[PDB]
Symmetry: none
Subunit: 220 residues, 6 copies
């Protein structure tokens, strides 16, 4: 990745093997759950184009989602060139040519070219640009891979409330969209998909009852 | 996090992967015990808003406690808006705008904005502010997660005193509260929940006697 | 390998034991897959001739695959002898003799001889030269050890689309080839080897449909 | 902890996660044996007040010893209040206020306050002060958690001499006391609690016989 | 071992524990195969006399093999005494006495004596001298501990060609010998110990067919 | 331990936790075998008096097997006091008092006192002196822990030649004494305790046959 040195200059360091091993290990155990998005932006903190490309080339299974992020950068490349049209002209002695869609993809850009990208004044975050898209690509995947809907989660006849919310938020955390959008499903299904003698208890608490309060009011 | 350099200036460093792995590992083994607050304020020592947010977005299982802090955080965010009302006006060349509830939440504040928050003169400790709320929010979870009451712990007919205390204060410590409150319970509980030929021994020791004398006299 | 020091000079460091262990560990688990090519150029970043030679003398198993790269290396070693004919003459006090096929092989070159190869002005990258050939030789191995073709991958009657793309690209990555060559196989087999009611859906989307769009249009 | 830098100044470093993990790991396997006292002063080498406090706050379970430690610490914390009476007066520009029992406890002292404690001229070792008490408090815990006395260790009719010494010093190490005190128990029980035909052999050796000599004479 | 410092002087460093642990781990898993000779000269890169002697005193099992190295070294020690006869005379202020068989053995040589052996001008490589003998001694061990001959390998009636070359080379790598000697066994057994309808295919390919060409024609 | 710095001065470093963990782990797996002498001189390379003492206090299994080494250090102390009688007199400004028996033990010597012991001109190896005695006692323990004698190992009527020497050299490796002493037991028991059809072939090779030459013609 790219970490600051003792001189205050941004230098590049060879990708550590500890991260590479964990990069595939997390995908060889969690596959594609809702706890893979934070792990895809924690170990890749300060990762360069090739760094992210090498991490995308090491994922046991789910090749469609592996190339999904690659196709997500190509689909976003159009807008990049539609919003930032690289102007023709010679490069300066201390400047670099404007990046396009293919250059952001990492198939027409060299390591040195991307090395100066994150080390400029001001340094254009080219590593974060892909990170966002990569995160966005994995974001949709998380909710798209959700095998359970939010309209299928219903309380059982003899099940605990701890597991109720456990699975209720399991698909809620997976199905990502908007902060308010997620709150809309927690006010028309949370207390709408309960039990016969478990709904009244929560209905008697009120709409201003905190999760803990509802969990303590239904404590068994 | 934010650690001092060799120039005496507060600089920011990318979150280490060793902590991230342990952050989930501790929650994937201890889940939510009475020693989760100390580990949430040890590895997050000097952590920034995003740092704590990234650690809160990476918790193996138990998703009905990670979002619980958010609710309390928002509830505590209103207190800051009712206590510290941000005054309207232009920012200075070496000053920053006053923070509010949403700014402390970490949804309307940028990394750079929080970067100067802990690096001021004097620097407002906004990083420890969240820790307190996070610890407070986690504190309640611990007590609520405790699956044993303090009025349910009773000495068995043939059990050792070493294991007695272990489970005796197991719920007491879990139910985080005021130091005096904990002492108030112990005073009229442990001695009132002993054995028939084990109560007199402790009752003959006296109320001013220490635990050492109450454990050495009952030594089997 | 060869890492820069604090004086700005290229010094050599003894191969770490953590890399050697991982070198065989990755070959004792992934054997010869499409995720071993990027791991064969990540842990060997800046590796010297002997360094890469010692990593090729630890590849557990593959009795007819370890020497396979050597055969291709020898064929590529003769290319340098026909392209760069070492001229006879005495060496200078600050210069070195031109390298050939056997010198690049690592059977007629000493550690000190290769030590000054990457530490010159300008320094000839002889360490990365082997990586290319080694990687090139490994590519054929993966293709030769590929037990799945691109004309055998066909969608099942009751299988998910997520797994479809996973294996579809799995063999595509195994058959190392030109980027355009891989694109030709993803435009005459991808939507050409689907189901009866799954082809029309993708056929109605159009040829300008992104992978994500096709995965979201067939979401089940 | 507090480690010297390259400028020769005592700087503070965030507690490493490797020690924290081992801290609980050693207490989750050795619990409270005679080999935990040296491990409680080896990983905490140069640890600050909070550092030692966090280590005792991460101890999962075993509250009996933790509660006893606080009782013992408090008892020794009042000894400094009767030996070192902090004199009232304003602090200097390069000096600090005298510490007391509560200040040493770590409930009325801030990290910065203890930061300058070990970084003075001369620096008052307040970090090692806690170690002594902590170790002293754990010493009694090990003695209170000793399920074998020194007057109960007796050689068996068909057991090896190696195991005898092993168990003979097993309880001896548990009962922490003066070196001379331990020597008195090894001259009235060691050769006093042997077998019928195993006592004469050691009795014929003499009182000046070394431990090794006793094992060689009773070699089987 | 012996690694160059920042002053360009050959200094000695305490043997790392990572290598020691791996030294036994590799001998406690791979026992004695064809991938133990390259691992016995990779972790011991620059190892001193005692360094190698300490690595030969931590090999679990392999009675003969362990002592064999010393036996072979003793037999090779006489060769040096018959080739290099140490001449009698006083040592110089900047010179050292000539080494012999016992001196190379490591039973009549001190650490300091060998310290200046690899740090001279020119420095006599006495550290790699033992490596050759050690490796040579281990070479026979592999052949002596080889439970499969090259004239016992025969293709099965229903076995894959991937395992065919495996078994064939399995003993080939074991029986350490000259490269030409191994080539003679791969031209009178390789295509001489095939199947009835598998020999003609290879016989029709010709003697100039490559290893990969023999697998393509027999591809199943 | 004591490792040289970049200034060429001998400085002290806090004992690493990895060594401490392995220190007890090696004794909690290998107990007291012949492969414990090299592990008690590799991890303790450059260990100080306290460093060794701390490692001698933490040993899982055979508790007082450490008191014999503590008694052998006091037994050898007498010889040191009988050979080197500390002369009375005041210490110099750059010198230290002569060490005696108690000082060598580590019960009447401070860390600073031993800190300047290995850091002098010339520096007296105080750490090696204790290490020698610590290794001496451990060396004797290996031969004292031998459960099988050299006159009890007898080749079976249905066992391999590898297993014959497997338990043959096993006792020889443990029973340590002198190089020639061990050779005397391998010339009156090695070929003296064989089989009826083995001895004949063992006496048909010669008395000056190598171990590898005694398993070549006998290979069956």
């Amino acid at each position: 990745p790219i970490v600051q040195n003792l001189q205050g200059q941004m230098v590049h360091q060879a990708i550590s093997p500890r991260t590479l091993n964990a990069w595939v290990k997390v995908v060889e155990e969690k596959a594609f759950s809702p706890e893979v998005i934070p792990m895809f932006s924690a170990l890749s903190e300060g990762a360069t184009p090739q760094d992210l490309n090498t991490m995308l080339n090491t994922v046991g299974g789910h090749q469609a989602a592996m190339q999904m992020l690659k196709e997500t950068i190509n689909e976003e490349a159009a807008e990049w060139d539609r919003l930032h049209p690289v102007h023709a002209g010679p490069i300066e002695p201390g400047q670099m040519r404007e990046p396009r869609g293919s250059d952001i993809a990492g198939t027409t850009s060299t390591l040195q070219e991307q090395i100066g990208w994150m080390t400029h004044n001001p340094p254009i975050p080219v590593g974060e640009i892909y990170k966002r898209w990569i995160i966005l690509g994995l974001n949709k995947i998380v909710r798209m891979y959700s095998p359970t809907s939010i309209l299928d989660i219903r309380q059982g006849p003899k099940e605990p409330f701890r597991d109720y919310v456990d699975r209720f938020y399991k698909t809620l955390r997976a199905e990502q969209a908007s902060q308010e959008v997620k709150n809309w499903m927690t006010e028309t299904l949370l207390v709408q998909n309960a039990n016969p003698d478990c709904k009244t208890i929560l209905k008697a608490l009120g709409p201003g009852a905190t999760l803990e309060e509802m969990m303590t009011a239904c404590q068994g």
